[PDB]
Amino acid sequence: ENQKLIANQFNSAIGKIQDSLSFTASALGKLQDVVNQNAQALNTLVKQLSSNFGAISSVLNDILSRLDKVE
Amino acid sequence: ENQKLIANQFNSAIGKIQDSLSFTASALGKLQDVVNQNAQALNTLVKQLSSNFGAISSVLNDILSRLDKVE
Amino acid sequence: ENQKLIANQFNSAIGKIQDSLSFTASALGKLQDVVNQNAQALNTLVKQLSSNFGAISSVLNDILSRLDKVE
Amino acid sequence: VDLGDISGINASVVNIQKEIDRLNEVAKNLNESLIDL
Amino acid sequence: VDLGDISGINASVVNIQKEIDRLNEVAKNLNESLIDL
Amino acid sequence: VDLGDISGINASVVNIQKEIDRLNEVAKNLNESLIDL
């Protein structure tokens, strides 16, 4: 009788721990997906910003050249 | 006697697993808060950068127009 | 006999739960490291961008001053 | 002069509140699995 | 005019797929630890 | 010309080292809950 109680409580606890492990795996997967997407977003932003700053640098250098040629 | 030992060890293990689940939930909550704050920060930075680059584009276009009108 | 079965199943389950806790700790540590590195990257990008925008502002103000002095 | 567009660069948000709530619910429910001989 | 360089600012990626796979494997293997008297 | 300010845009850091340390401590302490008949 007490053995049946121990076995039933243990099976219930193992089921709850299985659910907890599945939910922890799901949460870690979602966190991984979002962290990786934000990392790709930051890298894309850095690349686009490098391109934009190169463009602004070229344009500003041309403007400085024209200002020198004028004055 | 052995049943009391099994029950005591099982209760101790379930208490430790409850503590572990609470700490995992706390860690996942902190990670969620920080990932979401950094996502909001990246989005705010992207919006402000779009505004700043629009402003720089307008100013540079005006400068190019003035340089054309001069030369 | 049933007590030996209960003890063996419980020891197996506790070993598997120990492995699961170690792997959850490792995953949370990796997520923490990556989230903190991306946070440092975003902060470094914000600082460098502030410097670059200050530089562009100074250069553009000088250009506007020169355009005023010319026309 | 046409600078590149960066408006599309978006940062997703994570919503694991269901999983955290379920983990706390299980940590509370494991009291119903304790053995009382 | 020389604007600062920002190309070095990189964002690491996390690879915890091994740990998630192992967690799901353990959640499946805990069925082999159930007690059947 | 006055460009917008972005210095306030900050990125928080996470400190779950207490929780990771406690998880490893529990994974080590669960050896004291093994049954030795």
Numbering used by the authors:
A (entry chain B), B (entry chain A), C (entry chain C): 918 to 988
D (entry chain D), E (entry chain E), F (entry chain F): 1164 to 1200
Task: Please share text taken word for word from the publication where this structure appeared.
We determined single-particle cryo-EM structures of the five selected single mutants and the Omicron triple mutant of HR1HR2 using the same molecular scaffold (NpDps4) and data processing workflow as for the EM structure of the wild-type HR1HR2 bundle. Thus, in both cases, the salt bridge between D936 and R1185 is disrupted by the respective variant mutants. This salt bridge disruption is associated with decreased cell–cell fusion activities for the D936Y and S940F mutants (65.8% and 24.6%, respectively, relative to that of the wild type). These structural effects correlate with changes in fusion activities for these mutants —the D936Y and S940F mutations result in a loss of a salt bridge along with a decrease in fusion activity, the V1176F mutation on HR2 slightly displaces Q957 on HR1 along with a decrease in fusion activity, and the A942S mutation introduces an additional hydrogen bond along with an increase in fusion activity. The fusion activities of the D936Y, L938F, and V1176F mutations are ∼60% of that of wild type, while the fusion activity of the S940F mutant is ∼25% of that of wild type. Overall, none of the five single and the Omicron triple mutations dramatically altered the architecture of the HR1HR2 bundle, as indicated by the small RMSDs between the wild-type and the mutant structures.
In each case, the process of viral membrane fusion is mediated by the trimeric viral spike glycoprotein (S) that is cleaved into S1 and S2 subunits by multiple host proteases upon infection. Two heptad repeat regions, HR1 and HR2, distant from each other in the prefusion S, drive membrane fusion by assembly into a six-helix bundle. This HR1HR2 bundle formation is thought to provide the energy for membrane fusion and is therefore a target for therapeutics, as exemplified by peptide inhibitors that disrupt infection by the HIV-1 (19, 20), SARS-CoV, MERS-CoV, SARS-CoV-2 (23–25), human parainfluenza virus 3 (26), and respiratory syncytial virus. We therefore designed a scaffold to efficiently determine structures of the postfusion HR1HR2 bundle and its mutants to near-atomic resolution by single-particle cryo-EM.
